[PDB]
């Protein structure tokens, strides 16, 4: 019968129609023809909640328990190697590869790449 805003005939397994949709004062199965009093049930309510992801925001991050954010110094990319900066003469430049070898100055941030 009554489950989660829905009601079924106790004879068959049919969903009983909405009493508010029902014009008369009683509800009868269109199939097994079991009549039911309308007033036997009325005025159900349903409460729901939204999903937790439905509205992403920055506050989500600050509500999260882990680090989603980045400062400036963590941005160090790759191990450092001794490299003469052809711009500023710095002795250290960070690098990455492809054998195509990047270079990035530690001091002036100057870059160049080396394929050879």
């Amino acid at each position: 019968s009554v489950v989660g805003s829905l009601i079924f005939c106790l004879d068959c397994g049919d969903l009983l129609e909405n009493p508010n949709a029902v014009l008369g004062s009683n509800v009868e199965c269109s199939q097994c023809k079991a009549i039911y009093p309308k007033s036997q049930f009325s005025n159900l309510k349903v409460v729901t909640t939204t999903a937790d992801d439905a509205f992403p925001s920055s506050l989500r991050a600050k509500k999260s328990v882990v680090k989603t954010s980045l400062k400036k110094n963590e941005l160090k990319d790759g191990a450092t190697i001794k490299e003469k900066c052809p711009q500023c003469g710095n002795e250290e430049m960070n690098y990455h590869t492809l054998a195509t070898v990047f270079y990035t100055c530690t001091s002036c941030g100057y870059k160049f790449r080396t394929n050879n």
């Binding site: 909405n18 508010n20 949709a21 005025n43 159900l44 309510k45 349903v46 409460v47 729901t48 909640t49 939204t50 439905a54 509205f55 992403p56 925001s57 920055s58 506050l59 400036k72 941030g109 870059k111 160049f112 790449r113």
Partner: protein, 280 residues
């Protein structure tokens, strides 16, 4: 740049230098101000309740702590009130009609106006102290078959515009490269920015929007930007090129004082014919 002479590039960015007197905080503060805000951002949770003499809907919205987003997104609950008080509602009952059609003290006074202007609103309420929540009731015809409220509403708040800017999306504060103090933005409006002068010098503003520069500032300055950008490409790739090539390329597309790609269009004006013949 060269091939399209695109009117709208995917990622135009206005480059905003600032006065020196301003601190980082103030800019950071200011960055939030001009920044774009959205309802979906400030919503803690939504809880809607439906009941069935008619088909009714009680709608409870939960926000975060007022101060927080008021600090975070620089928000006055009054707008937050007014925004819903105006645009949110107007949108809200609107689609539901289409949805249905598809199927085939002062608060009490404040509550009075909205209910009047808008059919299905039987109640309005809001948290006027903590701002922690807004909550209100709606009703529909009894015979009306079920609608899914959450998703309909879910769609809305993401379309909300608590406080947008004239063709301005997000401003971001990068690091002070080369002793330069600048803000980075998406979207391009010069006029709107012309009011922020207290924070920012105007004359150092640059963008990729070059057409709009040409639109606003004319051809010459625009040309200068053209070189800058193109260089920055190779620059990132650490590839040196004589500006003479660039200027040649630059002065070339400007000979009409307009912004000319190299394509059927840019070629079209050619007095020389056969060159247009063998091309396409």
């Amino acid at each position: 740049i060269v091939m399209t002479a695109s009117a709208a590039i995917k990622t135009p960015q206005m480059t905003l230098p600032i006065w020196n007197d301003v601190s980082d905080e103030q800019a950071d503060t200011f960055c939030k101000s001009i920044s774009k805000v959205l309802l979906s951002e400030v919503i803690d949770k939504v809880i809607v309740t439906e009941t069935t003499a008619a088909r009714s809907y009680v709608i409870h919205m939960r926000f975060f702590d007022n101060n927080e987003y008021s600090e975070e997104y620089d928000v006055s609950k009054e707008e937050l009130q007014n925004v819903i008080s105006n645009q949110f509602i107007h949108l809200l009952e609107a689609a539901i009609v289409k949805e249905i059609k598809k199927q085939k003290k002062v608060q009490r006074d404040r509550q009075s106006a909205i209910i009047s202007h808008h059919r299905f609103i039987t109640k309005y309420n809001f948290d006027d102290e903590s701002g922690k929540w807004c909550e209100f009731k709606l009703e529909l015809a009894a015979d009306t078959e079920k609608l899914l409220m959450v998703n309909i509403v879910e769609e809305i708040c993401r379309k909300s515009i608590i406080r947008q800017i004239p063709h301005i999306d997000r401003c971001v504060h990068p690091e002070p490269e080369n002793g330069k103090r600048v803000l980075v933005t998406e979207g391009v409006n010069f006029q709107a920015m012309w009011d922020q002068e207290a924070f920012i010098d105007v004359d150092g503003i640059t963008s990729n929007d070059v057409a709009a520069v040409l639109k606003t500032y004319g051809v010459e300055a625009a040309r200068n930007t053209i070189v800058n950008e193109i260089n920055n490409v190779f620059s990132r790739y650490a590839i040196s090129v004589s500006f003479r090539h660039l200027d040649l390329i630059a002065d070339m597309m400007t000979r009409q004082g307009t912004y000319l790609a190299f394509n059927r269009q840019g070629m079209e004006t050619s007095t020389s014919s056969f060159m247009k013949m063998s091309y396409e």
